Amino acid sequence: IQEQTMLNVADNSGARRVMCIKVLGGSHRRYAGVGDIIKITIKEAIPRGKVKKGDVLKAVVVRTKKGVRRPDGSVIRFDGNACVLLNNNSEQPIGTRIFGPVTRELRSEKFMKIISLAPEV
Amino acid sequence: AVQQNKPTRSKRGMRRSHDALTAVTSLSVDKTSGEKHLRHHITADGYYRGRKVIAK
Amino acid sequence: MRHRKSGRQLNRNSSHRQAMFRNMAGSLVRHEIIKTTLPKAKELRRVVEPLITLAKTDSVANRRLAFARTRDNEIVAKLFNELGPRFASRAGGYTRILKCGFRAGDNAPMAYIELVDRSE
RNA sequence: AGGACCGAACCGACUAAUGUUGAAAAAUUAGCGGAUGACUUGUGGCUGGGGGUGAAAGGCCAAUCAAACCGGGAGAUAGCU
RNA sequence: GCUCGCCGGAAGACCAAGGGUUCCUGUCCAACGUUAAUCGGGGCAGGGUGAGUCGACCCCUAAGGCGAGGCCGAAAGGCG
RNA sequence: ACACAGGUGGUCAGGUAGAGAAUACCAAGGCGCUUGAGAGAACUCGGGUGAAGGAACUAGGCAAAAUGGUGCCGUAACUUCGGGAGAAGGCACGCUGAUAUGUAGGUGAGGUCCCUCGCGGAUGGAGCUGAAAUCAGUCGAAGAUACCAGCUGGCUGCAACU
RNA sequence: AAUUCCUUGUCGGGUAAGUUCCGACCUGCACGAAUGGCGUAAUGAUGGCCAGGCUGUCUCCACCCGAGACUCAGUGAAAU
RNA sequence: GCUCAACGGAUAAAAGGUACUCCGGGGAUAACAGGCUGAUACCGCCCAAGAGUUCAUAUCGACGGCGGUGUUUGGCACCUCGAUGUCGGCUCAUCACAUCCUGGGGCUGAAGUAGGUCCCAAGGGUAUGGCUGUUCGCCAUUUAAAGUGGUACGCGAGCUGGGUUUAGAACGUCGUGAGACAGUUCGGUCCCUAUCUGCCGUGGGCGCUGGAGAACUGAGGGGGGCUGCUCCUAGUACGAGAGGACCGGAGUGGACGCAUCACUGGUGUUCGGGUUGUCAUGCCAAUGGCACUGCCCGGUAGCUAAAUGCGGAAGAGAUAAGUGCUGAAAGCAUCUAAGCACGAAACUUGCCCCGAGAUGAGUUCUCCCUGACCCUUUAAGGGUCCUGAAGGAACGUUGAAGACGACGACGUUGAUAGGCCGGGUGUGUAAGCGCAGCGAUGCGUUGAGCUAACCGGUACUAAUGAACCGUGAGGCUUAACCU
Structure with a gap:
């Protein structure tokens, strides 16, 4: 979310704990956590995941403890901070299957595949 | 902190121009006893606006 | 900042303020007239008048609540026996502040x- | 048994903050180190200045120390202000 | 006087050192007290300290000091 | 220099909880610290609580925050076989009742004998005090419920160590 | 290397990124055997580094409680 | 009889260290900063052998030349040694334009996309981290870009102290040694209560010409001026393809500023509850004090961001570079000389705020004051009595106003605070009694009881009527109007 933020991975190919090295989009953007794309290092990885430790690639935040605010004032708060790993050049999901809840805020462009694969929207 | 030159007796008086006391300019008179009192205060013989309110 | 905020600190902490107004309420109930400083009297209105408003209805729960907010059983007895009926008709305003000098x-x-309704 | 351990009194003084015309001519507050020993403490005594004493720092010798304090030579001298 | 708070292996009480009347009683509020003061350890008077058993004194000695004679040192003096 | 937040040797040491002279609250005793009244700006000091992220701060985790107790298990490299080592890590902690009208245990009254017959011995087992455990029940969000009370691990330099 | 100027030497590690650290190489400006050489369990208010935890250190401050600061009465300085 | 050779020769005869240092002076003399200069530096131009696929100037330019700046290395020693704090960082800035981005152009060796170079343009904007003390530098990752300089290489009576710049210690090297090092390493006291100017806020006094109560005009001044991503046009123009439009529209963000608290949150020592230890209220029960608010769990108002709203515009005028029209001097030519037209995020306005002390003190509306006497050195003036007006101030209750003033509401014809009534909220089934149980405890009365700054009401309390200030018709010169 912020820089120096550890996140869980929703998708399978992305592995375990990941850290946000940069908040992409914006000159001095401090905090971005709803549908935003963040540059990611892999701080710890299982070997079954395709990506490995020390590798930089993009991600999109899917779950935030801060939570989205709906238009009527509703706040959906998800426990845990989660990301879906994306390729640096393509920004397309590496993982074949997305796990856990997703929000309807991730309905734009390449995130349609994420909400298609993920069970609960 | 310190001054580089001594301030003048003139500038002392100009600073104390706005340091002056204010007169009372009015004293209310109670109806029952003729003593003048501070307005909305006890008359110092024990009367408010028209009645004896404290023994002392 | 102080916007729509009640409560006068009077340069003391909350425990001292509570203890001071408990003792001042006890003295005001006991003697029926006291000399204080003016803000002290003004917040003394706010502690003393709900005690008589509680003391209008006499029950064991109300005497226990008055003992909680005074810790003086003589003051509880005076509030529920001598005063209370005296101020029963009065819809608030049991206290009158008369400004003295300095x-x-x-x-x-x-x-x-x-x-x-002071007897003197 | 322990120049054992944890830890009060006790002895010291590691970091920070306040103070810095202070409450104080090195303190206070949070934490700190030793605390049965080469410990600490009271009461006396001894060592005197090119001297003492020093688990050593030019440390200490009365808020004074690469040579204390007091008086004398002394109105030293000062091509300098 | 009644309530409140504080300390309570002390901010309680007693000795030691040190101080020296600061003790108690009456009176006064000029200077003192970082304010007012009727109060005080302030001023000014008057009282108060009772020992065979407690300390000192005393009997003894430690570290050490002084040391007749003595030894040593230019005198002062050092050591004993 | 002061009616100064410092320094000053010994002695006594009540209750409850606690290993305790810690600490919390109280006894007995002594005090509120010789300027007060308001208002509740910035800023300063000492604290409290913080959404999300968490060392990105910074010269440096400086400071703060955390961990902290007792019992039972369990514990690595290396080692001078003492250590390391409270290594690290895990579990249980409150109340009420039963076991057991209060148990193990401690302290011991009558009584009973004996003797060089008194401050005697021996035998008793009434009363008093009483830790810990186990089992069931029960309350909160929480049971070392406050104060008090350790942060831990890996690699190195130097000096053996106090 | 508490020593290597060049030097942030070269490699491998740890990080996304490492003049620190750790381990090797020897090319020792300018190590070397009681002016002691090399290691060493334990120990250290020691020097350097890396983690877990934890948090207002930080992003970026916000509110609250007290002591000042403000006003009112009394006394009332300082450097220059 | 002297290399008394430092040769006008101190004495027969004399080396060093001080970071442990001390004294008297000196900016007579270095370090820092400022001043002069500008050799060097940086920037620009002159010529143009060349370099460029052929093709000096699309792009650079040898050999040489001339300038500009104060700006880097230096020179000097004017200043500062009876004192001008030293790098960096943090916070806060301001200026220049030799312009990094955004705007307007010219040339291109500019098919498009994307660039190069030059001109105009300073309105706004112009990263986060790792290493290390660093400015630097290397790197990792952003962005439209992460400008270049000045400001005592801005900023220590603003902060830091890693750095240097002390006293302790050690290593390498030099010296017999004390000690030394433009070596290294570990450790190592950064003070100010603001007089003046200056700002930022906020008042008092008098003026503006009789005194008031309002509402404004706008001379001036300040704030604000940023941009990305996607889609349409359009896969169109452009193109062999690959790629892919400096027009014109639409949304959506980032950073920034302003307001607000309806929501989501935080806080909430002034509400409710749980709970540990102890003490008290005689005791059980119920409560209270103290232990950081004892620890917590929640939380109303208020404040606030992390919440939501809003905005930096479009225009208009005059222009810069630039492009032109008509048009001579110069029958052709020519953007200029007379004329005429466009042309920028710059300028002036448009948006917001201040603002007549705008001494040039402005405008409009309304209210209010129309009595005598005496002296009299006459724009003239005094003294006395009578009368004090419109209004203000004081006092009091106060405010989502406030350091204090100031400002706003209300003052008995009164809702201005407190209290009271009802609600709302927040916390979570009070006490008491009864029942089940051996008891802890449970269950019922009971969503009970408490409740804050909140909402709607209510004269129960305090806002007493005086009094005070403020006046009495307002100066001299050129007009209609009638006397």
Whole structure:
């Protein structure tokens, strides 16, 4: 979310704990956590995941403890901070299957595949 | 902190121009006893606006 | 900042303020007229008047609540026996503040806060 | 048994903050180190200045120390202000 | 006087050192007290300290000091 | 220099909880610290609580925050076989009742004998005090419920160590 | 290397990124055997580094409680 | 009889260290900063052998030349040694334009996309981290870009102290040694209560010409001026393809500023509850004090961001570079000389705020004051009595106003605070009694009881009527109007 933020991975190919090295989009953007794309290092990885430790690639935040605010004032708060790993050049999901809840805020462009694969929207 | 030159007796008086006391300019008179009192205060013989309110 | 905020600190902590107004309420109930400083009397209105409003209805729960907010059983007995019926008709305003002059040691605005139906 | 351990009194003084015309001519507050020993403490005594004493720092010798304090030579001298 | 708070292996009480009347009683509020003061350890008077058993004194000695004679040192003096 | 937040040797040491002279609250005793009254700006000091992220701060985790107790298990490299080592890590902690009208245990009254017959011995087992455990029940969000009370691990330099 | 100027030497590690650290190489400006050489369990208010935890250190401050600061009465300085 | 050779020769005869240092002076003399200069530096131009696929100037330019700046290395020693704090960082800035981005152009060796170079343009904007003390530098990752300089290489009576710049210690090297090092390493006291100017806020006094109560005009001044991503046009123009439009529209963000608290949150020592230890209220029960608010769990108002709203515009005028029209001097030519037209995020306005002390003190509306006497050195003036007006101030209750003033509401014809009534909220089934149980405890009365700054009401309390200030018709010169 912020820089120096550890996140869980929703998708399978992305592995375990990941850290946000940069908040992409914006000159001095401090905090971005709803549908935003963040540059990611892999701080710890299982070997079954395709990506490995020390590798930089993009991600999109899917779950935030801060939570989205709906238009009527509703706040959906998800426990845990989660990301879906994306390729640096393509920004397309590496993982074949997305796990856990997703929000309807991730309905734009390449995130349609994420909400298609993920069970609960 | 310190001054580089001594301030003048003139500038002392100009600073104390706005340091002056204010007169009372009015004293209310109670109806029952003729003593003048501070307005909305006890008359110092024990009367408010028209009645004896404290023994002392 | 102080916007729509009640409560006068009077340069003391909350425990001292509570203890001071408990003792002042006890003295005001006991003697029916006391001399205080003026803000002290003004917040003394706010502690003393709900005690008589509680003391209008006499029950063991209300005497226990009055003992909680005074810790003086003589004051509880006076509130529920001598006063209470006296102020039963009065819809608030048991306290009257009469401003006196100024204190000698410190120039403090002085006041006499008294019960309205004082026998003297 | 322990120049054992944890830890009060006790002895010291590691970091920070306040103070810095202070409450104080090195303190206070949070934490700190030793605390049965080469410990600490009271009461006396001894060592005197090119001297003492020093688990050593030019440390200490009365808020004074690469040579204390007091008086004398002394109105030293000062091509300098 | 009644309530409140504080300390309570002390901010309680007693000795030691040190101080020296600061003790108690009456009176006064000029200077003192970081304010007012009727109060005080302030001023000014008057009282108060009772020992065979407690300390000192005393009997003894430690570290050490002084040391007749003595030894040594230019005198002062050092050591004993 | 002061009616100064410092320094000053010994002695006594009540209750409850506690290993305790810690600490919390109280006894007995002594005090509120010789300027007060308001208002509740910035800023300063000492604290409290913080959404999300968490060392990105910074010269440096400086400071703060955390961990902290007792019992039972369990514990690595290396080692001078003492250590390391409270290594690290895990579990249980409150109340009420039963076991057991209060148990193990401690302290011991009558009584009973004996003797050089008194401050004697021996035998008793009434009363008093009483830790810990186990089992069931029960309350909160929480049971070392406050104060008090350790942060831990890996690699190195130097000096053996106090 | 508490020593290597060049030097942030070269490699491998740890990080996304490492003049620190750790381990090797020897090319020792300018190590070397009681002016002691090399290691060493334990120990250290020691020097350097890396983690877990934890948090207002930080992003970026916000509110609250007290002591000042403000006003009022009394006394009332300082450097220059 | 002297290399008394430092040769006008101190004495027969004399080396060093001080970071442990001390004294008297000196900016007579270095370090820092400022001043002069500008050799060097940086920037620009002159010529143009060349370099460029052929093709000096699309792009650079040898050999040489001339300038500009104060700006880097230096020179000097004017200043500062009876004192001008030293790098960096943090916070806060301001200026220049030799312009990094955004705007307007010219040339291109500019098919498009994307660039190069030059001109105009200073309105706004112009990263986060790792290493290390660093400015630097290397790197990792952003962005439209992460400008270049000045400001005592801005900023220590603003902060830091890693750095240097002390006293302790050690290593390498030099010296017999004390000690030394433009070596290294570990450790190592950064003070100010603001008089003046200056700002930022906020008042008092008098003026503006009789005194008031309002509402404004706008001379001036300040704030604000940023941009990305996607889609349409359009896969169109452009193109062999690959790629892919400096027009014109639409949304959506980032950073920034302003307001607000309806929501989501935080806080909430002034509400409710749980709970540990102890003490008290005689005791059980119920409560209270103290232990950081004892620890917590929640939380109303208020404040606030992390919440939501809003905005930096479009225009208009005059222009810069630039492009032109008509048009001579110069029958052709020519953007200029007379004329005429466009042309920028710059300028002036448009948006917001201040603002007549705008001494040039402005405008409009309304209210209010129309009595005598005496002296009299006459724009003239005094003294006395009578009368004090419109209004203000004081006092009091106060405010989502406030350091204090100031400002706003209300003052008995009164809702201005407190209290009271009802609600709302927040916390979570009070006490008491009864029942089940051996008891802890449970269950019922009971969503009970408490409740804050909140909402709607209510004269129960305090806002007493005086009094005070403020006046009495307002100066001299050129007009209609009638006397």
